[PDB]
Design an enzyme around this catalytic site. Structure first.
Site, mmCIF file in Angstrom:
data_model
loop_
_atom_site.group_PDB
_atom_site.id
_atom_site.type_symbol
_atom_site.label_atom_id
_atom_site.label_comp_id
_atom_site.label_asym_id
_atom_site.label_seq_id
_atom_site.Cartn_x
_atom_site.Cartn_y
_atom_site.Cartn_z
ATOM 1 N N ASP A 181 -24.568 -45.513 -12.309
ATOM 2 C CA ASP A 181 -26.022 -45.332 -12.356
ATOM 3 C C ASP A 181 -26.530 -45.308 -13.796
ATOM 4 O O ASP A 181 -26.394 -44.306 -14.492
ATOM 5 C CB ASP A 181 -26.441 -44.061 -11.629
ATOM 6 C CG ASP A 181 -27.956 -43.956 -11.451
ATOM 7 O OD1 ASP A 181 -28.699 -44.757 -12.047
ATOM 8 O OD2 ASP A 181 -28.399 -43.081 -10.693
ATOM 9 N N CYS A 241 -35.923 -48.031 -12.289
ATOM 10 C CA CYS A 241 -34.555 -48.022 -11.756
ATOM 11 C C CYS A 241 -34.004 -49.364 -11.434
ATOM 12 O O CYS A 241 -32.900 -49.701 -11.880
ATOM 13 C CB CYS A 241 -34.413 -47.113 -10.542
ATOM 14 S SG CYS A 241 -35.290 -47.531 -9.086
ATOM 15 N N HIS A 294 -34.230 -45.316 -4.755
ATOM 16 C CA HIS A 294 -33.475 -45.366 -5.995
ATOM 17 C C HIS A 294 -32.446 -46.513 -5.966
ATOM 18 O O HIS A 294 -31.851 -46.788 -4.927
ATOM 19 C CB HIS A 294 -32.790 -44.026 -6.272
ATOM 20 C CG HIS A 294 -32.121 -43.977 -7.607
ATOM 21 N ND1 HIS A 294 -32.594 -44.679 -8.697
ATOM 22 C CD2 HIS A 294 -30.998 -43.349 -8.026
ATOM 23 C CE1 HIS A 294 -31.800 -44.471 -9.732
ATOM 24 N NE2 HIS A 294 -30.827 -43.666 -9.352
ATOM 25 N N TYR A 326 -58.246 -18.902 8.972
ATOM 26 C CA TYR A 326 -57.699 -18.676 10.310
ATOM 27 C C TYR A 326 -57.273 -19.978 10.991
ATOM 28 O O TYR A 326 -56.249 -20.017 11.673
ATOM 29 C CB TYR A 326 -58.658 -17.870 11.192
ATOM 30 C CG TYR A 326 -58.330 -16.388 11.251
ATOM 31 C CD1 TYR A 326 -57.086 -15.944 11.699
ATOM 32 C CD2 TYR A 326 -59.270 -15.433 10.872
ATOM 33 C CE1 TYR A 326 -56.781 -14.576 11.754
ATOM 34 C CE2 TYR A 326 -58.976 -14.072 10.923
ATOM 35 C CZ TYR A 326 -57.735 -13.642 11.363
ATOM 36 O OH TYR A 326 -57.457 -12.278 11.410
ATOM 37 N N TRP A 361 -42.718 -44.389 -15.980
ATOM 38 C CA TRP A 361 -43.196 -44.287 -14.597
ATOM 39 C C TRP A 361 -44.647 -43.800 -14.452
ATOM 40 O O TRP A 361 -45.100 -43.540 -13.332
ATOM 41 C CB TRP A 361 -42.308 -43.338 -13.791
ATOM 42 C CG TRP A 361 -40.930 -43.878 -13.469
ATOM 43 C CD1 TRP A 361 -40.514 -44.434 -12.290
ATOM 44 C CD2 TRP A 361 -39.793 -43.884 -14.337
ATOM 45 N NE1 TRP A 361 -39.190 -44.792 -12.377
ATOM 46 C CE2 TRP A 361 -38.724 -44.464 -13.622
ATOM 47 C CE3 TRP A 361 -39.578 -43.456 -15.654
ATOM 48 C CZ2 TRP A 361 -37.460 -44.626 -14.175
ATOM 49 C CZ3 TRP A 361 -38.319 -43.621 -16.206
ATOM 50 C CH2 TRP A 361 -37.276 -44.209 -15.467
#
Lengths: 650, 4
Positions: free
Chosen positions: A344, A276, A321, A481, A240
């Site tokens: 999976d 995947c 996925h 700030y 990946w």
């Protein structure tokens, strides 16, 4: 009585393939589906089979260590009585010199390559022939088979169709990519058989593995482990990092065939590279090939925080996925879990599933196999604490998608994994899933002086009987700030943080002057952010807190009688809070009612770290009542520090 | 796929 002479055995490739929906696979080898009759024809030289004198017995064996007890070897006579559910052979046609037989296999027979043999005894003398080989597959058309699908259109889609779509992109931009599963292409079935034959369970106990191939739950499970590399025998190597130069890019593939071929062609060595969807696509191919009804599914996640950072930089969360679902009964589980099962193959065992999609929707996470993994893919739980309030910067389990039966359209199956948000069914599931709770807040419990070092605490409370193993990221950055986060000034990360039942922990991070000194803002502000992660059930706790680094206090002492218009002396001092030295120090003092002029006193020498500094001013009250003396302190590194002192007169 |  002359002994029968077998001339040849015809495997009826044509009529068998057609009937078993294996025509493409019937190259020159016979392939059939279990629990369904199939045909073959013996051609004899000379006289034909005479039942009255001839006894024909069939033998089948599969795998390196067949046995009848394990169901990988069978013997059965050619006879008229046909026992349903068994291995049998019976005559259905008999011509001049031909004898057509019908064979049937149990619907729960082990799939695989079988060698078929025939024993022909005429009274005393006997003979043996190897008729040939056939391959036996799961049968979605057979009602007694665990993979039975009662809809023909769905059997076409999930078993026979060689192209489909795999969904990618994001929830907002659902992208489809075409894909050639090619489960019936030349060589593919042989490769799938090899894939089973190299799995670790076959290495450990060959005869047992071949026998367990009667189960699609077992076969599915084995396929889910063999798709990724891990042990170099696996099919694909994942990557990946966006660097695929010494291999093929995951985005480049348009089918499973080339990947499977490459793998086999190099002696069953990993193919580079996959992601995947590619692991899921190959698995789907293998499963369809063996005849288990399968589809590729995609789930989407989204985001708007410390969470993001934690993921940027071993399960994690992607934009999308993919995995697979396969269709089968579950006689190994409580009744009612037959149906779609998630598997999976994307990288306790390298395998993942099968788990009933239904047990996932219900939060029944003890159901085998690996329920929590799949559950965590479609459920996340994110909560803030500001001081408890649900956070929606992260959303998991959206627009779960798979190709429509017999149409180039997308089907949304989100409902199959998740009850509606807010629904009472959803709440019952979260309840079955994770049996007041756990909380996290930033503590300091101290003054934090500009210049000093000090600890902040991630204070974590576990008020349940459950033990949790968590990751904790606790870090600090200067915060201006206008709210913008400046550079980081302290980080702590625990990969393993254990919280016993009904306990608590205060996890420290040291904040150091050296690290914050120069990255500070006009504000003197530091933001502390903590994230507590519990990866099993996929729960996240966020705790934030801004801290104000205070300036030293200017000590002001009045000396003398406060009587109306008497003299008075003001003693003003400050203790250097820095571990370094102050230079160009000057106090400015004024106050109408006490002094009429503005006194400014320079400090000649540098004021050393930790050291005090005193100056005095004569004052002249003039009226009875309250007067405030006011003071500014200036220096090179510590600026505009103020103080005041009430004085009452009489 | 990219980390979300």
């Amino acid at each position: 009585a002359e002994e029968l002479v077998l001339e040849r055995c015809d495997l009826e490739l044509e009529t068998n393939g057609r009937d078993h929906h294996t025509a493409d696979l019937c190259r020159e080898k016979l392939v059939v589906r279990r629990g369904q009759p199939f045909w073959l024809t013996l051609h004899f030289e000379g006289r034909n089979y005479e039942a009255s004198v001839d006894s024909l017995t069939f033998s089948v064996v599969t795998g390196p260590a067949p046995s009848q007890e394990a169901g990988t070897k069978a013997r059965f006579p050619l006879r008229d009585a046909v026992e349903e559910g068994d291995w049998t052979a019976t005559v259905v046609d008999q011509q001049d010199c031909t004898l057509s037989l019908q064979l049937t296999t149990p619907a729960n027979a082990p799939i695989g390559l079988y060698r078929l043999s025939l024993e022909a005894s005429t009274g005393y003398q006997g003979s043996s022939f190897v008729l040939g080989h056939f391959i036996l597959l799961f049968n979605a058309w057979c009602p007694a088979d665990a993979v039975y699908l009662d809809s023909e259109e769905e059997r076409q889609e999930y078993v026979l169709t060689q192209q489909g779509f795999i969904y990618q992109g994001s929830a907002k931009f659902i992208k489809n990519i075409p894909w050639n599963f090619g489960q019936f292409e030349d060589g593919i079935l042989d490769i799938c058989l090899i894939l089973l034959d190299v799995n670790p369970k076959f290495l450990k106990n060959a005869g047992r593995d071949c026998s367990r191939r009667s189960s699609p739950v077992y076969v599915g499970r084995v396929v889910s482990g063999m798709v990724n590399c891990n042990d170099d025998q696996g099919v694909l190597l994942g990557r990946w990092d966006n660097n695929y130069g010494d291999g093929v890019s995951p985005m480049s593939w348009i089918g499973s065939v080339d990947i499977l071929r490459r793998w086999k062609n190099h002696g069953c060595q990993r193919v580079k590279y996959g992601q995947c969807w590619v692991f899921a696509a190959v698995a789907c191919t293998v499963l369809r090939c063996l005849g288990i009804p399968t589809r590729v599914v995609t789930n989407y996640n989204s985001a708007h925080n410390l969470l993001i950072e934690y993921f940027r930089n071993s399960e994690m969360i992607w934009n999308f996925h993919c995995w697979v679902e396969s269709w089968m009964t579950r006689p190994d589980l409580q009744p009612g879990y037959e149906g779609w099962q998630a598997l999976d193959p994307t990288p306790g065992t390298y395998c993942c599933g099968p788990v009933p999609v239904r047990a996932i929707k219900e939060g029944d996470l003890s159901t085998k196999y690996d329920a929590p993994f799949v559950f965590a893919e479609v459920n996340a739980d994110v909560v803030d604490w500001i001081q408890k309030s649900i956070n929606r910067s992260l959303i998991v389990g959206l627009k779960i998608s798979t190709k429509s039966v017999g149409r180039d359209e997308r089907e949304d199956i989100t409902h199959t994994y998740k009850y509606p948000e807010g629904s009472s069914e959803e709440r019952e599931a979260f309840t079955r899933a994770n049996h007041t709770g756990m909380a996290m807040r930033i503590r300091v419990g101290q003054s934090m002086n500009m210049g000093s070092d000090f600890d902040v605490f991630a204070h974590i409370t576990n008020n349940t009987a459950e033990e949790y193993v968590c990751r904790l990221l606790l870090c600090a950055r200067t915060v201006s700030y206008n709210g913008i986060l400046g550079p980081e000034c302290g980080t702590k990360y625990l990969l393993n943080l254990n919280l016993e039942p009904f306990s608590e922990k205060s996890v420290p991070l040291c904040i150091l002057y050296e690290k914050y000194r120069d990255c500070l803002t006009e504000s003197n502000l530091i933001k502390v952010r903590a994230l507590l992660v519990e990866p099993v059930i996929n729960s996240y706790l966020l705790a934030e807190r801004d801290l104000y680094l205070e300036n030293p206090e200017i000590k002001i002492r009045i000396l003398g009688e406060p009587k109306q218009k008497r003299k008075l002396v003001a003693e003003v001092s400050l203790q250097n809070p820095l571990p370094v030295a102050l230079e160009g120090c000057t106090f400015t003092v004024e106050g109408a009612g006490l002094t009429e002029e503005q006194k400014t006193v320079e400090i000649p020498d540098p004021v050393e770290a930790g050291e005090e500094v005193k100056v005095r001013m004569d004052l002249l009250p003039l009226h009875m009542g309250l007067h405030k003396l006011v003071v500014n302190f200036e220096s090179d590194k510590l600026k505009a520090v103020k103080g005041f002192r009430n004085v009452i007169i009489g | 796929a990219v980390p979300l």
